[PDB]
Amino acid sequence: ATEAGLLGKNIMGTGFDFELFVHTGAGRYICGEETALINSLEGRRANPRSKPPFPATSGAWGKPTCVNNVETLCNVPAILANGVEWYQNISKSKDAGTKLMGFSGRVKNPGLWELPFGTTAREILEDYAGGMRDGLKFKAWQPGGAGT
Amino acid sequence: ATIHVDGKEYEVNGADNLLEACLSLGLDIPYFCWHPALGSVGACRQCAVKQYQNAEDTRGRLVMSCMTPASDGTFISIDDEEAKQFRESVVEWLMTNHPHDCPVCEEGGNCHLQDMTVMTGHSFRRYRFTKRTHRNQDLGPFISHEMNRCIACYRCVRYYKDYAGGTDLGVYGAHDNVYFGRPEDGTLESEFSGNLVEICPTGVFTDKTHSERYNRKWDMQFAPSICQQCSIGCNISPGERYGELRRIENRYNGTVNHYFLCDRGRFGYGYVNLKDRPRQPVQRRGDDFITLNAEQAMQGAADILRQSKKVIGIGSPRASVESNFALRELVGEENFYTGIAHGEQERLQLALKVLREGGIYTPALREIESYDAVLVLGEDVTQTGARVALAVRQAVKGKAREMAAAQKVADWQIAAILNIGQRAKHPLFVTNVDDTRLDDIAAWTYRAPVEDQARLGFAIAHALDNSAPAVDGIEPELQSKIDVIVQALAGAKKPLIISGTNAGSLEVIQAAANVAKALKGRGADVGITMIARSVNSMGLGIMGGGSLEEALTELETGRADAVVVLENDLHRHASATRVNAALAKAPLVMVVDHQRTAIMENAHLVLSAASFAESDGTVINNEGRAQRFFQVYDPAYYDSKTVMLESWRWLHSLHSTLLSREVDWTQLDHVIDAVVAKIPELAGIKDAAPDATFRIRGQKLAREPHRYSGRTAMRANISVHEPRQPQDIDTMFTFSMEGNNQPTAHRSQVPFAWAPGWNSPQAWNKFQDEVGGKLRFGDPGVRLFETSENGLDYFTSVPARFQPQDGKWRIAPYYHLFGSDELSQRAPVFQSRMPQPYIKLNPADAAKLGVNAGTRVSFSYDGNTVTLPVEIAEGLTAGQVGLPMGMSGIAPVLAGAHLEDLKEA
Amino acid sequence: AFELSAAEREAIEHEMHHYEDPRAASIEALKIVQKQRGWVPDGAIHAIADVLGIPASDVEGVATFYSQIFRQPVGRHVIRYCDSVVCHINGYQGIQAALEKKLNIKPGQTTFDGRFTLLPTCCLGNCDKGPNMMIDEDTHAHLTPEAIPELLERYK
């Protein structure tokens, strides 16, 4: 992208200069927290910070800094290309957009599928994951990773 | 702002967090990680209170009282069941891995964790599994390290890094395996590492010097005193047991030394407990050595004094105001000689003239932390006046504090303060002969001889105001640096200029005074600070007298056949050979001192004086504040043979026996009234502390805690009959627990901090009007002089550029914190800490001499061909030799002197 | 006895070029030293503190805080097997038992020759193909205990 005029100086000729870097972490679970992500980005220990002050005003190196997930930044260009009301017209739910859902752990077909909001959790287990495996029963489930 | 605690309406300061807002009113909330000086980080989670936003609110929310601002209209509950249960749970969680080490712990009865374990009412242990352990590091001769007792409250790393500026203490480890220390073993090289023994709430960092001869806190007999190891005069609490000084603790002074001492003043007390010290008066007939008690010694001294035509007295900047005045009134006004040399006295008189005549307000040590731009001319503060260096660090971080406060961040959110101010900090420009310990934060460091530092100061003063005398011959690069310093100092709001008599030059002080005057002329709130050498240098300069050279030439010419040397070694301000000749020539030498000085062989009479732990007196610090230091113990309680009295008492009884042939042991109040009567300019020392008739509702003030132990058995080895306890007729304190030490008593002199349920050094919170601010009912000690209405003129005598003469080597002073004090180097704990005596050379001059580092170079000064190993100093300027002052055989009077015959031998 | 080489120092300086603070390149500096030397020895902490200018206590805290910044010597290859919840449902304990039976050591210990260093690690981000195991740069999914000896022979 830097070679073909999309990253660097004078992107497309608008007059906006943006530099993009990859900071590979050293493997700590608490680094995912936004203030701890800022702390580890500055080369310090990944201890989280007090909020307020929130990172949007005094974040990385005391500068305004916005921390976002990968899926939000992957959601934004579809909004910017195909419009706003189209993005509001994907599902008839209060939480607009499409979420990458999927069941995992001793299911028939564990995987990852992009589904709209409001799809029931039984549909992901049955229509996509196929339910439990051979000779297995269902006891419990946990929606949002280990911290749920 | 107005808050509501349990239905009670309290008026608080709305710019403060809730924790010390409640602690100011006397409301007990358990806390570990918060400190009044460091700030809030919200780590220990112990300060939980239940907050309500409406007056009718049932649920509320458990919020951190150290992290919630005390705004107008907050209804917090402390003694609620949910908050109390959570605080007990936090104490329990901290008690899961804590070792069973309380009897064998140096902070038993001084532990913050013990107070907060009993405060939350947690006494039942249902944790049944194993406890984590950690190894220990050897942190040096001062700090004993026991990591098992830690609770991970992060106070040590916060203080040592974000406050003290140290780089060797850090936080390592993992989830629960958190370690706090160095990456390896070795000495903590910060000059403020001693405050870790009271910053740490647990017994991790402890005083090793106290741990050698250890006693519990209730066994200590405390007193309020002033630290004698340099001129800053930080207030300390010496505490003794069994007749020897056990531990120097910090004493809260909201204007000088609020929460922090330095290591020289905290661990340098070991000279008091030396067995070589004179404890009885000893008289010589030839080679025969006899011991007298006080009366026959006084009568014989008066007889020999009457049998002489002129008695002269050599005082000392180490002794108190009253003892020097007693010597002055004993020997006469014209025959009183200050023990310092001519150059040191000239610099001291110039510093006093700039202070009490220059028209520029000299700030106190607490007030230094608010000044914007700091210019240090000549003075190596961190090794001489270290607490001023710590306050300089605070004033430097004040810029990040200002940008944080501009972004609507409260002052106690210290993490946000260093978050916004990443590396931006206030300008600091230090000048020295070499690199300093303030170079990590200094905006610029000028490594040059004292003539070039003085010329830099004169250049700054001229480039500020054109009426100042200009110096011509500055290189354009140094001119650009001059312009940078000028732009930084002129654009500030509270500039500070720090100089002193330790630079070894007079023109440095003149240049600093001219810079301060030029800053004052532009309409700025400028302050100045001269750091003197000894504790009572300023008082001796205020009183005045002759120099040591004049006293020595009076002794050598024969006009003085009797000399009384008060608390002076005489080799620190003059050459040893000349002093020995002038003392062997004189037919009577009377040394009144508490230390075995080298001149006591020449002394015909030796009078055992008392040190700061055994004497009362007044000392004047470097900012003109008179401060009274009190007696800790009577030396004759345990050793009944000991005749060891106050030096002013010795000299006053000698004066009375010389006049009227009667022995009259006086009182401190009489001597204080005599000083404020005969000397108008020392009249403020009457207001330094109240007299011996001062009572708190009829009773005196206790020197020992209410649970002092072993009254009927600590002297039972000598005699089973316990004698009458000693009576203190001089001061308002008593050598007993029958006294007043409540935190709400109308007094300013506090011997020690103790409150019911508060045994730690955090018990000082009850003794203040607001927590972290001034002491309640005012801080002790008053300033001797005010700021003058008009100031001095421009000092016109600029110096010349340093041209290195061949053969002669200018001596550059390299002061060390451990070793440059006369009494602190006598402590046996400093011998394992002080560096080896190295002569410091430029690489160019060492290559010219052909000497490499490690080899010995012999130098001769007045017939003393003394050899020293060589260290290479790149920052030292060519033509100089770097010498450590205050060491063995190297006096501080050697600064600025020449050095011929510098050959490899 | 430590001294940074040319490549490590130049890479460290290039990482300082990426940020506005030399402190921010401490993690990547430690990762560079770990990649070159296998781990971060004691003198490397002071060398990194010298090149970045930050105190050595800060470098020590950063190095000991993160799990995959090794502060102790390891073998030729570091096995990092996932022990989290999804692989526990998928049965990582069989693979742990297989590795313990093969290498004849415990998780956290090294073999006497210095071949493999077995360590548990957090979630590898590949839970749909659990259980997984991350050897030095290769991840392995859909593991079975019987395939452990065939898997360990591809690293001499």
Ligand code: SF4
């Ligand atoms: S630090 Fe306090 S709680 Fe811990 S062992 Fe010592 S006295 Fe007991």
Ligand code: SF4
């Ligand atoms: S060593 Fe002391 S000051 Fe440091 S975190 Fe532990 S308890 Fe707190």
Ligand code: SF4
């Ligand atoms: S700065 Fe000076 S007066 Fe204060 S504790 Fe240190 S040696 Fe004593």
Ligand code: FES
């Ligand atoms: S005192 Fe508030 S969390 Fe420690």
Ligand code: FES
């Ligand atoms: S739980 Fe093992 S890869 Fe995620």
Ligand SMILES: [Ca+2]
């Ligand atoms: Ca007394």
